[model samples]
Target chain A: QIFNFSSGPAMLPAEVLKQAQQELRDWNGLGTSVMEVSHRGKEFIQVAEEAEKDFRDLLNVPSNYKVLFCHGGGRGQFAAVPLNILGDKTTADYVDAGYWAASAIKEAKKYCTPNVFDAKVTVDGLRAVKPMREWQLSDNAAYMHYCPNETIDGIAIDETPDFGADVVVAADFSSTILSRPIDVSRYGVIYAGAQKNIGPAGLTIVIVREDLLGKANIACPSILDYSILNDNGSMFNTPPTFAWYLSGLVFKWLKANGGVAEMDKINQQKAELLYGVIDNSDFYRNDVAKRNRSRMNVPFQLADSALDKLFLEESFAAGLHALKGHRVVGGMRASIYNAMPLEGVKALTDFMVEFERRHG
Target chain B: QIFNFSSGPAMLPAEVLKQAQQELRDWNGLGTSVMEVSHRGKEFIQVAEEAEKDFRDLLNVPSNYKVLFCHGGGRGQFAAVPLNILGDKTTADYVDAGYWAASAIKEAKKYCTPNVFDAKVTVDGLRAVKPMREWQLSDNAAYMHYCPNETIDGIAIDETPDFGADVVVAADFSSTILSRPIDVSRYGVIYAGAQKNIGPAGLTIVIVREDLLGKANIACPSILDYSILNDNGSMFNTPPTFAWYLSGLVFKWLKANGGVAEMDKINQQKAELLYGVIDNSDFYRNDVAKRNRSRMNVPFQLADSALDKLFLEESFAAGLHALKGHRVVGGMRASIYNAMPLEGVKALTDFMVEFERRHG
Candidate 1:
């Protein structure tokens, strides 16, 4: 198998897939696939509990927070965040950093008036964000919502923002959760769709400060209600059991692989390698500002526009897959999430060098 | 491997598990797990489209209906139903039959006044549901909601109900879908969680008539909005791709193994085998009226009650897994979904007979 850079539902670790395949038929001597067992049953319940525990342990989640494995992906949380934490306030501060922060603002409008704060700026013709401290925050807003990393735009906010104790901070970490470590105490809520850095598509991981619980709007869907979900131990309904199990496997893998600290260093190395080639060559270019460029998703364009088709065809034929960038950003994207090995990044960079030399 | 009798996230067909296991690492020669592929890419879109098409074909779903692959489970629909279809109305008729019906009513209360119509009755000291004609539905309610089969209670309403031309009908077909063929045109909406009869836990299938598309309540989560979801072809968010793929495989398996009509016949046979042993033996009995007893779940109690623990221990020791009934209706349950072959049911009955004889 070659490298996969498909962004989300992105490539999982080769080891995790192999272990899952081996046990797909009969899990833990239970004589049934983990997917075929009841979520309420002992076997699956253990999977759920252990996954949550390991996730908490990995992040050193504070005692005041609850780690919930939920359904409806990150998009679901776009609606859930405002509904659950809005209390009696009619507005929340939304920092418009990139594509996902804007999405959260759209969903917030249905329940509350969102105060959209434009944080995007152009530094030397490259897209970047105004640092969090420079952004205007709403007075007495319900909560502040932002996406720390934008998957589609290939942008990231590398710092953990603290908005004083009065303002609860919520972030969409879908593409950047466990790729590195963060200060869990600084935020009220952190949610990530599991496909990118955690496990699979169906599961969404939500970490909420206990104080943020139990204030859902009356009309909130019970499934997306954080209070109801947390109260039920994230089994408010039959959860995506298989996804939860796979996520547990990933959490274990992350732990066995020296946890998030090690991942942060390696991810840095992988990102720098790809960006190094683009910076050195006039044949390749990346438009995002260096500080804001995402380590997980790196998007770049070839110097010659017409070579895009040939570039994709050759790359794909050579066993490098899903390098085509998002339609929103037409170029090439290499999403190197936690599951992507350093070897895969090296191979992609090597291919890029060869392609540029041949074409130039 | 033993026969697993779990009710939800119940036993899938062995053939499906085997095929999924074989393809877990590399699917369709793509050299990456299907779970690892992009949902927007041609690969997963084909999977989503083909799964929807096969499901429609299996049910003979009308062209007027839009099939949506959604997140959140059946319980999510408990909230989504009223939020979506209660158009300019403050009430919807909710039939009180069993466990899941009450759950829907509880969530509906948040959106609108649910007109609770009691449809449960006792016939010869056995639980049964009043026929559709006898159900006192609310006048001018937005729609009538009911669960066709209650998994925990082992009860089912076997007919597709029509409430004349003016009234729209919505039914939770979670455990009952595809076990038999029903007229799709008779209902405004049909929803099912995938774990029971489809594939895995994360995917929820919603089939709604086109007319019911745009009536979502103002506060409804966009993730649960039928119109937005249908407009997006159920890719409103990154869907449960792996679960969708597995369900597609199950759909293909259903078509290859003679479709729902064949399942209906085999399901009847499987139910009868278990019910026969219970009815003929003085040592065990089922409380549901024969007319309303579920074909998928057969819940029975031992004559002595004291023998329940011993029965479960012995049965499990004999390689029969998850036979213990739901805590709500405790004794024992043999959930004989479409995936459970005749041979599995035969094994359970054979075990039950030997146990009863020894205890008697």
Candidate 2:
């Protein structure tokens, strides 16, 4: 009955958690916690293989790609993207959407001359800007990077863009990854932080084109080297064992829960239920344009700014947690990820109606 | 009663595990898992502060030293050490003693011309090396790197060697890090992967002299950048939250168990007991010289190599596990870390004697 709407490190499937609790101590009669096992061992190798297989199957990843289970989070990839793929080219293109995209642009600046293009702007709390065809593309750039979903601003690009030949496209799918089917063949590289919809915060998932390996500039850490990770099966260093193990459990849970296709339908329902309630209510207004509103995260504001604190306090009393907005964008954000059931969304919408009825 | 002897990702104190279990679901009644909380938040900042404070107090760290909780285990630092401290110099010195030391040398080759030094050889299975006076110290070297204790090969440099002027000494203390008391001022840098004595596998701890922060080569990943981590309080990226939390628990447990000084005393006794049994029995023999043998890891061999399988099988049945020797050096290795009690050592030693008697 409880709802967890925190963005990253958000709600994990209850079934996965239950399975983890049951196997926590014994772990297939190994007589040790999975965290205690060596990642290089056969047991952990099986865990990694099964998880990667499930993940690739769910996303329909192409065989030309190498999936690297890495340690650093999404922000680490902001630097890693340029460090690995920016070969002889010293310029890259970035789409500045929100906080996460800005962070990527900021980190890339240290390594390359990043060409920044502003994403569609929000006018009167709704998306309003030029279409994708109007984007100023960089020709000399090594790659074009964009965040498919901005968790904080409640913006999502549901479909991958076609950047044409000569431009390698990379996307940060940290927020919307695995929520629905993704076309892996369309992009050169797809990277995600596991915390949001995958697993824990420490682990990062990178699906890089095989050709992108071994091209890092001389100063890149060997651990972050795409070629090294690809060659060593991401076992170049001792990985976060428990986090990787939990990711496997989550992948298995995803498979059991009708895969990404089914989850997409459920996610749509959950997002619509919450967004419908907010749109219908005059007291609760979402600033994001209807066309660009995120199916995962929905950030909204009250008619009266002073009522925000009261809303959060009463929300907590009703077992709705982490509904507060990120400091960068103040208001309230409700992140309903893949693990969030339809009932949880119903509960939140129900609470919103009652709170507005009393407070209005 | 089970004694786990895996190297790093080795073992943990029972009390720490108990506390972790209690805090797993709800941390301080916050209604959110600690893993779900933002690292920049007050709750996690307190966790980071308390862990660093306890670590500093336990080691009596100097005012000029900054403790960094980072990702990418010892291997990560293999590259980080050179990248962060190499300054404008293009060369560094590395002492090769075993697997870990060789890894450091290998990683350094990518950043600088690593001056590899051959450590003293093993005589009659005992390490026979000349004193520090005989070392071919590098004058043009940015820093001198060495692993004080080789976890795989049971050898250690008990005292920090005086490598002369302008030469900064960095040691990978992954194995013997928290097992004994260390004079933090003696070395320019001391780094360890938390898997062994600290906590989990992924989290790495680095204590560096203040003067060494901003010297990173432009090619280094920002996650591995000392200045970035130091300035942001190791929250430059989303660190391994659960591992960080678990390490904090382990640090608190160390303080409760009389700190590092007490741990060193108990470690000495445990090493002596296990080594005593090996020395007295013709069936089993320890190769490392008396002075160089590691207190944390004790590698021993039987008179007959064929008896290895029998020894491991019998020992496991006796509640001792992972006693198999490293593949490079086949025999048996008893890695007695900080979490290991004297009773566990006694039990292991007793089992070793019984196994030798029956197998021999």
Candidate 3:
């Protein structure tokens, strides 16, 4: 089987996709696709609630954190994070590690005056970062924001940033969420578009602490209001029902396969194996710092930049698909998210050695 | 085969569902569900653009209108409509007829003050409304808004409203967009949530006039901003890819079978046959004014309200599905949308006849 490694809208577990196919025509003996059920109907309402329960159970989410399934993009929540949470505050601190962090700051500026801080540290080969910087945070800052994983640049912090116990920290976990265990209690709000470890591209899952519910700015769209969503159980409007049901199926699969703990072990192995292959050879190199290399997205470069096209073509021909790097940062990025099996990484390493032997 | 009669998130063609299932395991020999493909890559980009083309072709959308597939609920657009089009204006006139219109007013109030006009006309058994109302449009109104069809209340306007050439009219075509032919030339914008005659529940399709772009309120979320979406071709963020693809298939199927013009004839026949039975009986009755009776949703009542449970149970046992009405107005609602074959309506009308014979 070809293994997909696209950064976002990435691969889903094969088992989950198989189940979704089998039930695509008839769901719960209803002779209708789950996508065709009314969101307000009892069956879909049950689907929504049970999915939340499974997601909560899999993550061990605290009681104070409310889980909501909304319809928006990864970038959509950047606007929502500020509009929904910044009711009375003027400035929020945004720490930039890479492309995505800067992107968040650009969106947040429209809602509130955001204090943008650059946290990137250059390296001889691999880049590095102080995830939480020692700097001036706006006194009445609404919250502190940053991305834990830069999908484009393949930078992952070894530890979650400490934003002081009294400070509210909101992190975009779009690429790395569900790959490992996260302390939900530490963050004020966490939002991930469901393109990566979740299900499809339409559903966005938000986990917010109870106190942050009623703080939407006056211009905040009701569709995006955190307070309204929490009150109506994400049924304030007809949700993306098919995406939500498939997401629930994914949460169930995670629980059945030992949740995030088992996932973290497998992810670590996949990263180590791929990175070891790159490190052992003069043919390819990765630029991210040793401690900062993302376990989910691993970006590397062929020694001869001229061979990039040949490398991608050969990889595509060999059943390792979407190994090409993002357009902004060129070369190759093999995103081994949680759904990418260890065998797929082994296959990639096996192909890498063959390519090096031929061209080195 | 069991026929599904849900009001929204309703039936899709069996052919489309089958194709989706077959392609679910391996798409274009890629060995990955299309859902796994990157939205920015050649494959998904092609899919998204092709879907856009097919949607435009199906609707014969004028060159002046820009089509966008966005992520949100049907009601989510209520807030977006005002934020995107109410440029510099403080109010817009909204005509209310039933549940959905009132709901739209409530959502728009968050963005701008709406001059709500009651267009609801009472009937002997149900409700009625003229699509366009007389006079009293606010001079400061940005646009006129109305629901062409109400899913819950079984109301449909046979004609698109004429608000003079100088005025811009925005419409909610959620339940009946492709069920019949429309004059794209008449409106400033047309929006529909995919779930009724379209594909899944997560994707919302917006066709806006070119001149209406770039007028989003300063506080509008970028996701719902029309100018940004049109400029970016709805790829501003990762879209609801699978839902958009399925909707393209639905549009293709519609064009191949006979576009909206042919579907209109069949839908009219279905409405006539079902409503004929209701008008024929004292054992059952429909309240909707004759001219305003929905060609899509037909709600009716039994002589005795107590028979509601038995009617639903027996109907379920007989393989007809979701024949129950909305809870707010209880009795029965048979939603016969485009994908619903004439055989399904025949089965429903046939069941109604047999049911009357026994229960009467």
Name the runs in model 2 displaced over 4 angstroms.
A122-125, A128-130, B123-125, B161-165
**iRMSD for each candidate structure, in the order shown:** 0.7, 1.8, 1.0
- Candidate 1, TM-score vs. the true structure? 0.99
Residue-wise lDDT of candidate 1 within A1-360, one digit each (tens)?
Answer: 478889998999889999999999889987778988888887788888899899999999999999988888999999889889999989899999888899888888898889899999999999999988897888989888889899888999987786788889999999999988899999999999999999999999999999888788888888888888888998888899889899999999999999999999999999999999999999999989988999999989998989999999999988899999998879889999999998999999899999999996
lDDT of 2 at A160: 59
DockQ of each: 0.90, 0.60, 0.84
- Native-contact fraction for each model? 0.91, 0.50, 0.89
Model 2 chain B — which ten-residue stretch has the worst lDDT?
B125-134
Residues B1-360, candidate 1, lDDT per residue (tens digit)?
Answer: 499898888888789889999999889898999998999999789888999999999999999999999998998998898889988989899998998999999888988898999898999899999999888877779999999999888999997686789889999999999999999999999999999999899999999999888778878888889999999999888999999999999999999999999999999999988899999999989999988999998888888988888998999998898988888777888889999999999998999899987986
Task: Estimate TM-scores for all models.
Answer: 0.99, 0.96, 0.98
lDDT of each model, Cα atoms only? 0.90, 0.85, 0.87
* Candidate 3 per-residue lDDT over residues B1-360, each given as its tens digit: 698898888989999999999999799888888899988888888888888888787778999999988978677789899989999988898889878889999988877788989888786655777546453577768998888888878888867666677788888999999887788989998999888988888899999999998878877778888889888989898988899889888988988899888999999999999999999998888888888889999888999988889999988888989989997998899999999999999998899899989997
Model 3 per-residue lDDT at B236? 90
The fnat score for candidate 1 comes to: 0.91
lDDT of 3 by residue, A98-201 (tens): 98889999999888888888878787745898645464577778898889999989898757656677688898989988999988998999999988998888
